Design a protein around this ligand. Structure first.
Ligand SMILES: [Zn+2]
Ligand SMILES: [Zn+2]
Ligand SMILES: [Zn+2]
Ligand SMILES: [Zn+2]
Lengths: 321, 323, 324, 325
């Protein structure tokens, strides 16, 4: 399939490189993160990707406790991204990096990126760190409501990307560093953060919000029924502030991508849960090979009509292209 | 379907009853947990369940920090269960409650339950608490290897059941108590505990072990591919002690049940990931209605041959009930 | 789900009533007749109780397609269409109509479709497979040359064509000899309709008229499950197909066809279809009165698909297709 | 996956070679002829390269079923079976055999099956649909009364019967008139075989002989997808079916049939079949030489199913069915 749109495609600036074992693989990953116009573009041309929506790596800004520095790095990453997109505006679009440890500053930067730089959304690596940085700040909190109101006003999607939990909140993984990151920790952290947004009633207040999750929903589709229906015999209204069910907000305010989850069985389950209209192709490059993502997607067992929607038209519609 | 086997069916004793909002629902749940020979049996007769493998509620013994007390309560709960099953041996089987905060005591009690009481396995509610009870004790730790060796020798399954993480290990849920328990926390806690067992190399050392997970695998099937294959271009071997991949241990040493997860889409995904031969019917009664579980299972969209296997024969084979 | 659209819902006129006599055993015949003749009463009450807002009505089978005499066929089609228009006018907010066509006379059929669409406001046509004409001993399929003008008009009017089943003629039914239970909905209906559909595709009809929309009931008459094989059998042979059409069967099926859930309330079948043709081309339907409306609706309300797709398959796909 | 078992793998003898002519034009015909006549060389090299340990061989089609003269049919069947036995003996560790049967003569077919199984060690029979006999203008289906003794012997010998496709006679193919491209594997093969299978079911054959094992290729010739409708159409009518069988079509399909992946390398189709008949009754097969072995193997190695089921469908279901353990 040609003309695909991919939207969990990362790059980095020297300031955030460290954020992402020594040897040839680490050297290659660094090269990939810094490259946009050469290797990346050639792979897009060879693997049917017309549009790549770029985003800064992780944890990047979300791991910068000093709001002053976080704002600085965010603006810097966004300016660099704007310059890179300008080189091939027919192929590259961008997601804004935001200094959410400072709600007002984040709202202002999103406005600048969207209104002045033409960015089409925001990508944030989970909770923010601020001050001593020992407290994970989730976006369902009160201080972020004004921000969400602006996101809805600008009407651009918010990509809730993973990050690892803080050490004090990672004891279950002690002795197992191999369970951190994309193996598992990333999914748990992101899935719960998403559930917090839903449970808080954020989508009752701002029903037009569009949230995007990668890695096929971080496991949510498979357990969505249970999330709402567990202990069904108990006919008492849910205790959370949100007015409806989790499945309602997931079905109406979320979209998921195939980033780093090239599994047909997983895609089929998602198609039967959230629907093909809300699944988007993505690769997670440079952490995943573009050819791996594309070759899998070209052959996965779905209707050709859905391969076109998931690979291209769903995204073009979502980002008003 | 008649003649089903259900194996995540709970009961409680006064001592552990408290482990399980005020009103009529709370009163009903308590009654259900204390009943075995009446209400429960009538529902089994009405909903095609021939065999029910019983287990104590949660967290129960795993939440008793004092080793002596934990050993006492486990003992009491197992003796009570043994007596209840003896009243109707053709309908009730039992899972042992174990005081794992004391590895040796736990091994001794499992042998006692299996060899002397005829129990067919063990059910443990996640990590154990001991001493000050502020440290979650996972079973992949070195001190539990002798125990696992005995489990394999006795050749009985180990049901790794959920429990909530300790407060200091649940900040991500702060302000959202509705995310604890069956809504989500139970799955994360159990899924990771299972992955720790796999990564530790436990199944290389004891390959004949049979581990059971409820709630359709606590989310594992859907993300299993990613667990091993993420960043596939990096051809460097994983650094965990285990010699093979997570999918290998999941496919070879685990079985999942339908407890509290009556969703056809989820069952189809599991069938295409772990296979119908490793999926077992279960309800999670009394936390779930038996009729809800049975009615869903009778109509779910699978082959009739698989409905027979998942509903009865997989369990009969696993617990050697045909000989 | 409320607000559903159903489009394989039948009725009969006195002149075609007996055609359904063999569909059900005795004792049930009286009830089936009542169902076929009723449009405004029981039918509407079932629609209100089972979340159906719009019902696109069609004459029963084989009806017009089994009338060998051209003059008579044209007469019955016009009468059936006039009656249907009268019935729809009584409850225009709930009933729409498919035209009955005397295709044993191409020109007349073309004229009648135009009348139904332009003057009566019908939204498409429903035809029970091949036509019989003259001695009526030869099945007339619509891929034949004489029907090209007709298809051009269908495309011009831009209304869908529902290719409904009918049993093959006795001389073309020997494989079922001694097994009358295999005729009809059990199996014969599907084979007859599936192949007729393939004949249309292979003939190149959709190369000539790419905007045509064909609808098949009973979840595609078995086509989705075997579609890959239909094109890819003997794939090692790198030679072009031998039929007139320029492309593959899957292309025409994916681009010119839609299938309904009529009389095939099976979740596994629906999942396969979703993974082959896609939810955007699957439509809810019941096959009332040959199938119970409650059976169709209750199954559809609980089938294992995404809620977004339940809305599309149950309502929006049809509203989009019929420009409602 | 290595160690697979494939069971819809054909060959031909000079006497039946022309039956496969019409299929491919030129050059491809030369290649197909080579493939059909070869058993020990190219075929074996492909098995070694594509993880196939066991290949259960069968004569091509329609072959014996299209020989109306009883004596000639018996002769050709015996000749094909003797050649097959000789070929299998060259490499018994890799090749097994299905018997060709002269069913236009029930007693003769019964005797030949006994000879093949008891004396030649064949593991089953493969028949290309209905038989032609005498004037050959009437399709002879195996649900007919005269074949009951034969079926009783099949059950006694306890070997599977592979009901393979064939095209219907011209007078029974008018629906395909003008569309020769719809005959054969494109569609006609499936319709012919699916209905023949339903006739066996409806006749009550499996009530009388419940231990029979029937095998269908091409993923069941379309049956799984429409199985619910076959039994449940017009469900509101609460009256029993009119056929002689005591139970439902789905019951006989579930209990007496097995389907193979021959010439139907489609994951969606396999998933539907897994959710209808179950992975325990699906078997890997290729339909070589009409289909490429690498096409079948490559698809099966990557299809979206549980690894445990890949092992069963690719090898253990067959080994259990043919008692190879
Ligand atoms: Zn990423
Ligand atoms: Zn439980
Ligand atoms: Zn109909
Ligand atoms: Zn074949």
């Amino acid at each position: 399939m040609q003309g695909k749109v991919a939207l969990e495609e990362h790059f980095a600036i020297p300031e955030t490189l460290q954020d992402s074992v020594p040897g040839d693989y680490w050297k290659e990953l660094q090269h990939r993160l810094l490259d946009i116009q050469d290797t990346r573009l050639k792979l897009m041309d060879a693997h049917g990707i017309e549009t790549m929506i770029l985003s800064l790596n992780a944890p990047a800004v979300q791991a910068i406790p000093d709001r002053r520095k976080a704002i600085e790095i965010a603006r810097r990453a966004n300016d660099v991204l704007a310059e890179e997109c300008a080189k091939r505006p027919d192929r590259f679009l961008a997601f804004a990096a935001l200094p959410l440890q400072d709600p007002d500053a984040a709202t202002e930067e999103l406005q600048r990126c969207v209104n002045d730089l033409g960015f089409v959304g925001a990508l944030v690596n989970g909770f923010s760190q601020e001050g001593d940085g020992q407290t994970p700040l989730y976006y369902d909190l009160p201080q972020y409501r004004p921000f969400w109101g602006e996101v809805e006003k600008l009407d651009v999607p918010f990509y809730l990307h993973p990050r690892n939990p803080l050490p004090q909140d990672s004891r279950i993984y002690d002795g197992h560093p191999w369970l951190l990151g994309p193996t598992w920790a990333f999914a748990q952290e992101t899935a719960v953060h998403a559930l917090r947004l839903m449970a808080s009633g954020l989508f009752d207040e701002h029903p037009r919000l569009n949230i995007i999750l990668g890695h096929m929903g971080e496991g949510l589709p498979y357990m969505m029924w249970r999330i709402d229906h567990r202990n069904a015999w108990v006919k008492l209204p849910p205790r959370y502030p949100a007015k409806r069910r989790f499945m309602d907000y997931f079905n109406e305010n979320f979209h998921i991508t195939t980033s780093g989850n090239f599994r047909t069985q997983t895609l089929i389950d998602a198609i039967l849960e959230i629907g093909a209209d809300r699944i988007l192709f993505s690769t997670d490059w440079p952490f995943e090979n573009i050819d791996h993502a594309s070759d899998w997607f070209n052959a996965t067992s779905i209707a050709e009509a859905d391969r076109v929607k998931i690979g291209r038209t769903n995204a073009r519609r979502l980002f008003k292209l």
